[PDB]
Amino acid sequence: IVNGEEAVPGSWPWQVSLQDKTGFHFCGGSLINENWVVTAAHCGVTTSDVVVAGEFDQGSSSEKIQKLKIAKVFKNSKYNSLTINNDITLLKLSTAASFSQTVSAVCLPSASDDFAAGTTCVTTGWGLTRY
Amino acid sequence: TPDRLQQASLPLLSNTNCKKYWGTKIKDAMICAGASGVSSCMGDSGGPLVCKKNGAWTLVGIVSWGSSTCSTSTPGVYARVTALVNWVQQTLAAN
């Protein structure tokens, strides 16, 4: 996030970190329940990747983070890689996440929910702060 | 990539208005936000864009694509969750 600000540790408990086996963060993702995380299909997740929850500082070793393994990757069959349309994938954790103060779910909208232009929302993640 | 979790509030745009920046690449399953002096960037992909509705934070978008230099005056493109949620329901129910 460019021009963002540091968040309060654990104030976005559904935010997870997608990291490959080398410990490299490559994509964010959101916990929708204790066995399911939602991410972008373009992230190209595989079962060797790991889902990290309860994390705030990637450089800290004193955090009670949860390193969850992925049982199965569910790439939306409508995902169009040429246009990056319908960019959503569901990951089913083999290890069910334990919810707490810093680990919980975001709410999913009804297909009918309207989110008006002008409405202030928010976005999070550990992506570049400047290109 | 910064070590500690970042955040930024940003406004939603209509697809029509977004078309002015991105033309035909914007599909009905996409939802724009930003162009506000703030911008999602590489590494954020897959993350959330949430809006508060009735007290609760609701997943409205999934960080997807946008400006290659993450310019803060151009809108980032997110996956529109409303158009994908039915698929999500079907998948959870079946597995």
């Binding site: 999913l108 | 508060k52 609760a56 934070w57």
Partner: peptide, 10 residues
């Protein structure tokens, strides 16, 4: 869902 136990400050 959507209600963090640690409230975000913006």
């Amino acid at each position: 869902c959507g209600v963090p136990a640690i409230q975000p400050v913006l």
